[PDB]
Amino acid sequence: KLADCSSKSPEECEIFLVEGDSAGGSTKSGRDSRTQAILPLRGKILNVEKARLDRILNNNEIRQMITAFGTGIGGDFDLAKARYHKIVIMTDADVDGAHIRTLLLTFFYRFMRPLIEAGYVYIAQPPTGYKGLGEMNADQLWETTMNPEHRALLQVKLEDAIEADQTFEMLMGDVVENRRQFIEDNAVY
Template identity: 45%
Template sequence: MGAGGSAKQARDRRFQAILPLRGKILNVERADDAALYKNNEISSLIVALGLGVQGGQDISGLRYGRVILLTDADVDGAHIRTLLLTFLFRFARELFVQGHVFVGMPPLYRLDVGKQSHYCYNDVELQQRLQGVSPGSFHIQRFKGLGEMMPEQLWSTTLDPSTRVLRRLTLGDAAQAAQLFSVLMGSQVAPRRQLIQEHAGRLDLDDLDI
């Protein structure tokens, strides 16, 4: 999760816990079990969630009802999210079967019109909000990352259960991410070349934002 400091300040300590991850986690596609458990970020995640050291289908020790992945809305954030999805899919896919895994959807923009503020989660929503607004009568702030948001903004837009936007991830979502990641980051060159050739010139980067 990015912006761990802001998220820790913004959360409600009564029912929310934050585990900041420093940078991108281990690429589990190329790691054996020994390397997996020696990795600090992975081992901290396993312990924090209560998954146990063996993983598998038994998630009876899970400590939280919802595991929410919260990353920046950019390419690096998408990569980190895919790494996390791939790990969870390979280590404890039952989390997806039982519907415990979510992606938090932080806003991309804050639109100020007069004394009113609106948070927009994509470009389409921003343009809809701007319809009928006089030029020069508004201000737009784009959030390049979660760290640019004040704790109160992060709470009201992304952490508050009454206002936040979550997307539940299915087993199919996780499998798709793991398959794509396996092709792009695995040791086999031929499948990766085939994927690039098939999608060259028409690949929508949004498709990679699992």
Template identity: 45%
Template sequence: MIAAIHVFVKDPQFQGQTKDKLNNTEVRSWVSGAIRPHLEQWLNNQQTQAQAIVTRAIQSAKARMASRAAVSEVRRKSPTSRRLNLPGKLADCSSNDPSRCELFLVEGDSAGGSAKQGRDRKFQAILPLRGKVLNAEQATEKKVLGNQELSDITNALGCGFGRSIDLSKLRYHKIVLLMDADSDGHHISTLLLTFFYRYMRPLIDEGYIYLAQPPLYKLEHQKKLYWLADDQEKLKLVNKLSKKGGKIDLQRFKGLGEMMPKILYDTTLNPSKRRLLQIRIEQEDRHSTETTISNLMGKDASERYRFVVQNALNVEDLDI
């Protein structure tokens, strides 16, 4: 149940810097006195609706209890227990300094194999993910924790989950989403970002989440190699080199697994050459971000349809 109430307060006092909650205790009695008699009368006269509200409240309470129980299962008691809980498919790094350590979440075992061979083992860890992960926007907290891929990510990070998250226990200060540069890769990245946004938001707020920018094309011209991230870069360079003459050899990568480990390191893993996009949400964008994620990733298909219809003409890149 949602209601908007307009209350005039002479000396308002708010809680915290965000000022999202009124701290004047006297307002509670005013509002209760004005609303409670009418609400009780309505509930007594509308027993069907009242029963539905009570049932919903009980279900919500049970869901909160189940979520707290599930969260307690992933809490880390000590550094030793965190090590024992690491997923078996994680290729960890040797450094114990979180500020230097990087975790790459890689799409598929094939790409994961190339990344494991090409990485710098001192500070780069690789966690392969199998298939598309669960859509955390449409799932309960217990179901999210029961998902193998998301559970592996949570265990690898070691900082807890949801309300129990503790960034002082975070094992990597760079968490990099390394997916294929195609629509499937973008979809998996979106699912992972939804999970981090909904259940591990402090990682985004503190700037720990990144998107890798692997090349989509390899272009060779007059014994020079170029690595291109997307179709726009490809068209721009092809037009430029065509004016110089000579043969242009162009190769599109179907996936990261096609890359030799050295090429993957040189183009995507090497800190001195790679391009990373840091995921940040500015204060003025928080409301629109919440709305967009709810509409695109939530259960209400009509909101997604409305978004697609409204923005269809603004699409620049379409991968079918």
């Protein structure tokens, strides 16, 4: 489950999406509980660009997010109900943490597209160590990634939907061939 912000006021409250349960637990003990809620993600989540809507709506991870954001999905998405003004993607600084990052953005882009425009969606900058989020201290996690003071955030910005449509379909889509070709063409070894 999600640990929520004591504060009732959506305007000031932020939710961290944390990769892994060890990172989640440490995050909880470190965060300023007034305005920071913590929803852990157990590993890779679902690649919606390849899944049919019945599977999507049955996914625990996907369902915990829909719940927590409380804004409905697709057609039924209304910004007004948003329970947090800052939604933060907090993953490891590894290739897997980048995978999970691209997964969450696929979900956002295909279901809560409205939310990206509104720029409530952010990407944490954890220590680019060899260490991961589950191996750090809560005070190390606090003042490096969470303390509203000495933290830096990348606010996610969409600026061409036609470009974004083709990209999400090529990378996260079911046709392997096109994905194989984008690797072939941009990969530098």
